[PDB]
Amino acid sequence: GSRFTSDAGREVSVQTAMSLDAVQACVKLISQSIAAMPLYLYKKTPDGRKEAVNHPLYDLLLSAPNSSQTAFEFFECILTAMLLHGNAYVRKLMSNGKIESLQFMHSSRLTISQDARGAYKYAYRKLDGTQIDVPSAQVWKIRGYSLDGENGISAIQYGAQVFGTALAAERQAGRAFTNGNLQQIYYSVAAFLTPEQREQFSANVAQSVESGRTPVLEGGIDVKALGLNPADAQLLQSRNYSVESICRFFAVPPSMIGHASGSGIEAQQLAFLGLTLAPWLRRIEQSLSLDLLTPGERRQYFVDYDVTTLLRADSAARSSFYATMVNNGVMTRDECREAEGLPKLGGNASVLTVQSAMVPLDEIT
Amino acid sequence: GSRFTSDAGREVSVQTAMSLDAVQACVKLISQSIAAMPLYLYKKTPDGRKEAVNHPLYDLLLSAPNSSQTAFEFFECILTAMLLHGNAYVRKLMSNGKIESLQFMHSSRLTISQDARGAYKYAYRKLDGTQIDVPSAQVWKIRGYSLDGENGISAIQYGAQVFGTALAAERQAGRAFTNGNLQQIYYSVAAFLTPEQREQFSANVAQSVESGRTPVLEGGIDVKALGLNPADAQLLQSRNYSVESICRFFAVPPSMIGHASGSGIEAQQLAFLGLTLAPWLRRIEQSLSLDLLTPGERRQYFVDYDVTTLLRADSAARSSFYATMVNNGVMTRDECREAEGLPKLGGNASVLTVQSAMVPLDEIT
Amino acid sequence: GSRFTSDAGREVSVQTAMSLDAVQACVKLISQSIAAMPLYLYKKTPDGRKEAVNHPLYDLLLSAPNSSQTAFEFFECILTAMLLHGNAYVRKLMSNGKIESLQFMHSSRLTISQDARGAYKYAYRKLDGTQIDVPSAQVWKIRGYSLDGENGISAIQYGAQVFGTALAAERQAGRAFTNGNLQQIYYSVAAFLTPEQREQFSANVAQSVESGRTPVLEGGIDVKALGLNPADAQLLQSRNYSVESICRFFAVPPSMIGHASGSGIEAQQLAFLGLTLAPWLRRIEQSLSLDLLTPGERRQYFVDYDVTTLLRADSAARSSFYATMVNNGVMTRDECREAEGLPKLGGNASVLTVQSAMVPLDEIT
Amino acid sequence: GSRFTSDAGREVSVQTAMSLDAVQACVKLISQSIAAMPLYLYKKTPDGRKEAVNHPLYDLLLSAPNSSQTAFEFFECILTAMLLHGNAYVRKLMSNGKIESLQFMHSSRLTISQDARGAYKYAYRKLDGTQIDVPSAQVWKIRGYSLDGENGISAIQYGAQVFGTALAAERQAGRAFTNGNLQQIYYSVAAFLTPEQREQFSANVAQSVESGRTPVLEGGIDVKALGLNPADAQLLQSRNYSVESICRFFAVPPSMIGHASGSGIEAQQLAFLGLTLAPWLRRIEQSLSLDLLTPGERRQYFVDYDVTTLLRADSAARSSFYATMVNNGVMTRDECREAEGLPKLGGNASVLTVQSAMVPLDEIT
């Protein structure tokens, strides 16, 4: 793919950026966390929100958007594209107005061209090899963060400078094991020796240390120890700072739940959600609702994520919450039984119950 | 099986990478954590949800996918395949339109070829050595984090850089005992010695040590001590940094449970689960639903893991949970008894009981 | 047995590995903890789980699997084999279909050969000396962790590199007491002395210090003190790191309950169980259920460990738990009396009791 | 009795190893902890469980296995035998098909030979010196952690390496007072002295010290001080590391109770028990059940330790326990009185009493 250069001299692209450690950690964490949560299609109702089931888009977004891929893989790929490359494209396969399936279009197999009217022309190369032009009315476009308003910003191009120094530091640390920057003891003899005498000296030292003897340094031989520090040779502080800088660059706090290196755990997920994942959830909801839904059904349907697997609480807290909710008559006991994976029961378990001494506010006298 | 290179010059592959302790710990933790969770097959019912004990796939998943392998072995192998190679392959032995058994196709006994139509040709090498052909519609291909869209990223290929440094550091730390970099006492003599005289010198030193006599340094002999640091020679700081870097590479936040090196116990378990395990469970269950289940069956059957063995709590917390969930008429007594593994008792123990001071909301006036 | 080599030069096998300290500690801890818990054979019942007693396998797994060994020793040997060598074999001694006894087969007395059909042939050398071929249908095979899917991984072969450095460090520390690397004071005389004068000088120094006198160093005698550090001579930091590395290698957290070097103790056992012992318990259950039970009885019986001796709580917690369980009518008082080793009493102590004001949820009006 | 070697050159055996303080502490702790727990013989009854006071083995185990040894001595010797040598031997003096007494066969008075059939021939040397033959069906052979399957691992043989370093360190620390490695003040004189002049020099120095007069250093005399460290000469850090290493070798997590060097007291007792004592108790009781009990008796009799002396609690905790276990109708008052060692009182004190507000679950409606 595309490549860029930095001051350190290293050339950064997607492959070398993913060769790093903090980049892979941050990208995988945010993408897999944001793709695990299930998307849903609701229907606006005077009674509340009905779970739209007979609509094609519901099954197309929950189970499998295609005959090959899966919703989890679909969303992880699309959000990885938005993080690294900048934009993401999918192809709408529709027949007789309704939508049949959605197919992701990778940027390596896609060609983007601008025509005379300012629009775009899309050409897609499928597996066999033939190129097929797809009309611009059958392409879903999602951007992310954009300085312009038309095309999203690319993390690789803008973060070339940050990635180059990290790559160079890693390369220096790796090559320190072969440059000879870790050697400690240097022998010295005050005479001229042919190379064969050099191998003989080295082999003799190895034999002496292997046999459990003690060096004696006869004649003009001498030994000196060189005052080095392998931590300074390996650049641990610099690499730690690079990790912190990458984490800050991807807008993921380095102390989010300490993925890189507030007392209760349940608060940690709350901070993670409300500080990092809210913008991505909102962006996906908005863009999907604008493009995948025609104005005929745009005012009757809306998509919305649910966050319950990421907000699982402690057992005592769950018990107290359920007890105080069912006691005040907010929710019936059948909802609690469903929420714990228990079979429902009929009768008065489906009606609201309230304390005995509760009089309507208009009935007091 | 990979034979990749690195800047430190050390070859990295599955065997050499598994020689490391940190990789052992991380891979084993993920694998034995996912594998030990039972995977249930459920059937949708109007009255909640019920297990599908009569479907063959249920006993195929809970107990044994094959006649020799168990479910634990099956899933730990498949998880290890995803973690290391990125792709896992499963063959469906199905007869009479129904699945009978499943077996795992190791990557060391496969040949994968690309056809003109984009389809894949699979050839499995049986135990006898015979080659057989497996149709592409009888394999269950499942992939890890995919940067391309169709193939998962192999951990070794992209982490060669981070594995090579660890390998070189470990090998140098081991070889410091052979190079003679830990020597500290050096004798000296102002004359020209023959080899047998040096051997006798070392033997006399050893004998004097044995007899408990202080040395005397008679004539032109002298002793010097080098200012060495064995910790610097063994690279302790570099090795520690490598451990935490590997843990960060495998998306495991280091030192959550002390394996690398929230106050209550259950808080840590929920953190580990909701931060690391949830993506793997979601991916596996969705892939299984899409591939192993026919489109007709997908509307009434679904799978779901059983997360209760990692949610064990304190005795007081469990007692409080059960007391407050029984007193409020959410669970019957028999369900709570079954949770503790006790014989059932029919009669009024199977109905919901609530405090006498309750009243339906509609009745009050 | 088999042996392997490392960079440090030390040759590692089972004997030298068990000559270490961390290896023995970790292996013994995990094996004895996992073997102490009692295995049980249950029978599936509509009323719950009946304790299968008349089945041969129940007594064969609880009291004594043989006429010589014991269930504790049986399981400690089998799990030690799985930890160190990689695999474990036992021999099924069966007559008229049912199982009479189980006999463990040690790897030193067993020979493994592969025939033309891909199967295995087993030959076992008993105490007297004669070799007996045993059919492959009378051998129980249990593996552990396997990279392949057929044979388990061996800790010795893969951890040769980790064990070699620890052995070499121990050897260096031991030999420092005879090499002469701990000497502090060196005398010096500016003349040539015959050896007899060396013994005389040493004896004179010993006599002077024994008589309580003070050295005077007449003439050209001199004394120098050499600036050494015995901690650096003995490699305490390196050996500490080796201990930590071994503990991490065996997947046992070094801070599990501090066996090598969360406030309540009861939480410590919970973490230990749920993080280290769950995979082994699950593996043993699965493999035993698959092999030792025919499909005729596989759907009516199942094995299951119980964990109560490892989860003993504080006295106040036990009292509170029992009181709140018997008060809400979850369990009768006879169960509590049994659990404390007290004789049961008849009458209303065997029926569930509940608070006076508890009305069935369908009876409220 | 062993005569093993080590890299430090110090012979290790039972006597030299017991010369160490850490081995003393660990072995004594384990032995006197297991021995002080009483071992009861129980008979199975439908109405719970009852002691077998009329069986001879009961009085043989509680009070005295012999006519000279007590139960405490018997079991502490047998535990020490397992810990040090790995194997313990007991002879059953049984007459008229029943056991009369048991005696302990020390390893220093046995000869064990291997026969062609694999059986063992035992010869005991009585006190008089007479040799007698003991059949292999009249010995109770019990073994510790066995790596082979038939013989336990002896601690000395495998820990020679870790005992030799401790022995060498202790001997050098002791011998620093004889070598003269603690001297710090050295006089000097620029002339050739005779021995009597040196003796007079030392005597004059001592007399000047006695008379309280400052020295004068008249002529060519001078004084120097060496930069020595007695802690480095005595190897304090090495000795501390050796202590903790030995504690780790005997599977005792160091510094649990301060013997080597959870906040409440009872938490520490439960930790010690459930982490160290449980395997020994389980092994001993299962071996006793298998060997001393005939197959006919094994279906109605079993043994069990009495763990209550290590579970003593605070006065407030004990009072709360008894109050809440009596108020709730689980224990009668007489049992609680007997727990505190008080005379019984018949009447209504022997029945279960419960609060008047209780009601059977079946009755409510």
| The Cα angle at residue D239 between residues D233 and D243, in degrees rounded to 5 | 175
> What is the DSSP secondary-structure string of A297-342?
TTTTEEE----SGGG---HHHHHHHHHHHHHTTSS-HHHHHHHTT-
Short-list B63, B33, B108, CA closest to B284: B33
Evaluate whether D5 touches D165 at the Cβ level (below 8 Å): no
| C92-to-C65, C89, D147 alpha-carbon distances in Å | 10, 10, 22
Interface membership of A9 toward B (CB under 8 Å): no
| The Cα angle at residue B145 between residues B142 and B148, in degrees rounded to 5 | 90
Q: Does the distance separating the beta carbons of C241 and B209 come in below 8 Å? A: no
Strand ranges (E), chain D: 39-45, 48-51, 87-95, 98-104, 110-114, 120-125, 131-134, 139-143, 185-189, 221-225, 301-305, 358-360
> What is the DSSP secondary-structure string of B166-211?
HHHHHHHHHHHHHHT-S--EEEEESS---HHHHHHHHHHHHHHHHH
At B61 the three-state DSSP class reads: helix
Q: Can you tell me the distance from the alpha carbon of D266 to that of D273, in angstroms, rounded to the nearest whole number?
A: 10
Which residues in chain B (43-72) have CB-CB distances under 8 A to chain A? 47-50
Task: Tell me whether strands C131-134 and C120-125 are parallel, antiparallel or unpaired.
Answer: antiparallel
Tokens (6 digits) for B263: 């106050």
Short-list A319, A177, A136, CA closest to B165: A177
Residues 6+ apart with CB under 8 A from B51: B40, B41, B42, B43, B58
Evaluate whether D249 touches D260 at the Cβ level (below 8 Å): no
Residues 6+ apart with CB under 8 A from D34: D75, D76, D79, D277, D280, D281, D284
Tokens (6 digits) for B92: 């469906």
Which chain D residues are closer than 8 Å to B333 by Cβ? 361
Interface membership of D231 toward C (CB under 8 Å): no
| The Cα angle at residue A256 between residues A244 and A29, in degrees rounded to 5 | 85
Q: Can you tell me the distance from the alpha carbon of D282 to that of D305, in angstroms, rounded to the nearest whole number?
A: 9
Q: Can you tell me the distance from the alpha carbon of A273 to that of A311, in angstroms, rounded to the nearest whole number?
A: 9
Helices C278-291 and B71-84 cross at an angle (nearest 10°) of 130
Q: Can you tell me the distance from the alpha carbon of A110 to that of A131, in angstroms, rounded to the nearest whole number?
A: 9
Q: Can you tell me the distance from the alpha carbon of C132 to that of A325, in angstroms, rounded to the nearest whole number?
A: 70
Q: Does the distance separating the beta carbons of C361 and A349 come in below 8 Å? A: yes
Tokens (6 digits) for A66: 């295609």
Where do we find the tokens 């009876």? C363
Interface membership of D364 toward B (CB under 8 Å): yes
Evaluate whether C258 touches D275 at the Cβ level (below 8 Å): no
Residues 6+ apart with CB under 8 A from B200: none
Q: Can you tell me the distance from the alpha carbon of A76 to that of A70, in angstroms, rounded to the nearest whole number?
A: 10
| The Cα angle at residue D289 between residues D288 and D291, in degrees rounded to 5 | 65
Q: Can you tell me the distance from the alpha carbon of A58 to that of A42, in angstroms, rounded to the nearest whole number?
A: 8
What are residue D104's phi and psi, to 5 degrees? Answer: -95, 125
Tokens (6 digits) for C281: 């318990």
Tokens (6 digits) for B243: 């451990």
Tokens (6 digits) for A116: 């005379």
Sign of the Cα pseudo-torsion (A31, A34, A36, A38, in order) = negative
Interface membership of B346 toward D (CB under 8 Å): no
Chains in touch with A (3+ beta-carbon pairs under 8 Å) read B, C
Which chain C residues are closer than 8 Å to A347 by Cβ? 361-362
Short-list C336, C337, C284, CA closest to C38: C284
Stated as kind and residue range, the H or E segment containing B359 is strand B358-360
What are residue D69's phi and psi, to 5 degrees? Answer: -85, 150
Using the CB atoms, write b or e for A38-75: b if 16+ within 10 Å.
bbbbbbeeeeeeeebeebebbbbbebbbbeebbbbbbb
Question: Any bridge partners for residue D42, and if so which?
Answer: D51, D302
Tokens (6 digits) for A161: 């400078």
Q: Can you tell me the distance from the alpha carbon of A102 to that of A90, in angstroms, rounded to the nearest whole number?
A: 7
Listed by the residue before each break, gaps in chain D with C–N over 2.5 Å are 261
One-letter amino acid for residue A280 of the chain: W
- DSSP class of D343: -
- DSSP class of D239: H
Using the CB atoms, write b or e for A336-360: b if 16+ within 10 Å.
bbeeeebebbeebbebebbeeeeee
Evaluate whether A347 touches C362 at the Cβ level (below 8 Å): yes
Q: Can you tell me the distance from the alpha carbon of D98 to that of D101, in angstroms, rounded to the nearest whole number?
A: 10
Q: Can you tell me the distance from the alpha carbon of A353 to that of B363, in angstroms, rounded to the nearest whole number?
A: 9
Q: Can you tell me the distance from the alpha carbon of C307 to that of C266, in angstroms, rounded to the nearest whole number?
A: 13
Tokens (6 digits) for B358: 């309750």
Whether A contacts D, i.e. 3 or more CB pairs less than 8 A apart, is: no
One-letter amino acid for residue D80 of the chain: T
Q: Can you tell me the distance from the alpha carbon of C9 to that of C5, in angstroms, rounded to the nearest whole number?
A: 6
One-letter amino acid for residue D32 of the chain: Q
Which chain A residues are closer than 8 Å to C362 by Cβ? 347-348
CA C232 from centroid of its chain's CA atoms: 32
Q: Can you tell me the distance from the alpha carbon of B235 to that of D339, in angstroms, rounded to the nearest whole number?
A: 60
Q: Can you tell me the distance from the alpha carbon of D359 to that of D365, in angstroms, rounded to the nearest whole number?
A: 11
Which residues in chain C (274-303) have CB-CB distances under 8 A to chain D? none
Short-list C223, A56, D142, C265, CA closest to B265: C265
Q: Does the distance separating the beta carbons of C329 and B217 come in below 8 Å? A: no
Question: Any bridge partners for residue C224, and if so which?
Answer: C186
Residues 6+ apart with CB under 8 A from B175: C7, C8
Q: Can you tell me the distance from the alpha carbon of A101 to that of A106, in angstroms, rounded to the nearest whole number?
A: 16
Which chain B residues are closer than 8 Å to D364 by Cβ? 348, 353
The CB-based long-range contact list for A40-48 (8 Å cut-off, 24+ gap) reads A40/A303, A40/A304, A40/A305, A40/A306, A41/A301, A41/A302, A41/A303, A42/A301, A42/A302, A42/A303, A42/A304, A43/A300, A43/A301, A44/A299, A44/A300, A44/A301, A44/A302
Q: How many CB atoms lie within 10 A of CB D360?
A: 13
Question: Any bridge partners for residue D40, and if so which?
Answer: D304
Stated as kind and residue range, the H or E segment containing B100 is strand B98-104
Diameter of chain D measured on Cα atoms: 116
| A282-to-A275, A304, D223 alpha-carbon distances in Å | 12, 9, 85
CA C217 from centroid of its chain's CA atoms: 60
Q: Can you tell me the distance from the alpha carbon of C39 to that of C71, in angstroms, rounded to the nearest whole number?
A: 9
Q: Can you tell me the distance from the alpha carbon of D72 to that of D61, in angstroms, rounded to the nearest whole number?
A: 10
| The Cα angle at residue B6 between residues B4 and B11, in degrees rounded to 5 | 50
Short-list C71, C77, C86, CA closest to C31: C77
Residues 6+ apart with CB under 8 A from B281: B34, B37, B305
Short-list D145, C92, B293, D282, CA closest to A70: B293
Tokens (6 digits) for B185: 């006492």
Q: How many CA atoms lie within 13 A of A19 on its CB side?
A: 21
Length of chain B as a residue count:
365
Which chain B residues are closer than 8 Å to A333 by Cβ? 328-330, 352
Which residues in chain B (171-200) have CB-CB distances under 8 A to chain C? 171, 173-175, 177-178, 182, 184-185
Q: Can you tell me the distance from the alpha carbon of A225 to that of B230, in angstroms, rounded to the nearest whole number?
A: 13
Short-list D235, D93, D242, CA closest to D159: D242
Where do we find the tokens 């009569």? B54
Distance from CA of C304 to the nearest CA of D (A): 19
Short-list C317, C328, B315, C336, CA closest to D330: C336
What are residue B41's phi and psi, to 5 degrees? Answer: -105, 125
What are residue A217's phi and psi, to 5 degrees? Answer: 55, 65
At B270 the three-state DSSP class reads: helix
Residues 6+ apart with CB under 8 A from C177: D8, D9, D165, D168, D169, D172
Evaluate whether A360 touches B365 at the Cβ level (below 8 Å): yes
| C206-to-B212, C199, C225, D190, D231 alpha-carbon distances in Å | 10, 11, 18, 23, 21
Q: Can you tell me the distance from the alpha carbon of D237 to that of D243, in angstroms, rounded to the nearest whole number?
A: 10
Q: Can you tell me the distance from the alpha carbon of A183 to that of A171, in angstroms, rounded to the nearest whole number?
A: 19
Diameter of chain C measured on Cα atoms: 116
Q: Can you tell me the distance from the alpha carbon of B79 to that of B73, in angstroms, rounded to the nearest whole number?
A: 10
Evaluate whether B9 touches B271 at the Cβ level (below 8 Å): no
What are residue C253's phi and psi, to 5 degrees? Answer: -55, 135
Q: Does the distance separating the beta carbons of D249 and C25 come in below 8 Å? A: yes
Interface membership of D268 toward C (CB under 8 Å): yes
Short-list D10, D33, D128, CA closest to D80: D33
Q: How many CA atoms lie within 13 A of D188 on its CB side?
A: 11
Tokens (6 digits) for C300: 């009516």
Tokens (6 digits) for C185: 């004071």
Q: Can you tell me the distance from the alpha carbon of B289 to that of B295, in angstroms, rounded to the nearest whole number?
A: 10
Short-list B64, B40, B70, B66, CA closest to B53: B40
Q: Can you tell me the distance from the alpha carbon of B342 to that of C339, in angstroms, rounded to the nearest whole number?
A: 13
Q: Left (φ > 0), alpha (ψ -120 to 50) or beta: where does B63 sit?
A: alpha
Diameter of chain B measured on Cα atoms: 116
SS3 track for chain C:
CCCEECCCCCEECHHHHHCCCHHHHHHHHHHHHHHHCCCCEEEEECCEEEECCCCHHHHHHHCCCCCCCCHHHHHHHHHHHHHHCCCEEEEEEEECCEEEEEEEECHHHEEEEECCCCCEEEEEECCCCCEEEECHHHEEEECCCCCCCCCCCCHHHHCHHHHHHHHHHHHHHHHHHHHCCCCCEEEEECCCCCHHHHHHHHHHHHHHHHCCCCCCCECCEEEEECCCCHHHHHCHHHHHHHHHHHHHHCCCCCCCCCCCCCCCHHHHHHHHHHHHHHHHHHHHHHHHHHHCCCCCCCCCEEECCCCCHHHCCCHHHHHHHHHHHHHCCCCCHHHHHHHCCCCCCCHHHHCCEEECCEEEHHHCC
The residue among A18, A54, A73, A328 with the most chain B CBs within 10 A of its CB, best to mutate, is A73
Q: How many CA atoms lie within 13 A of A338 on its CB side?
A: 13
Experimentally determined by: cryo-EM
Residues 6+ apart with CB under 8 A from D341: none
- DSSP class of B12: B
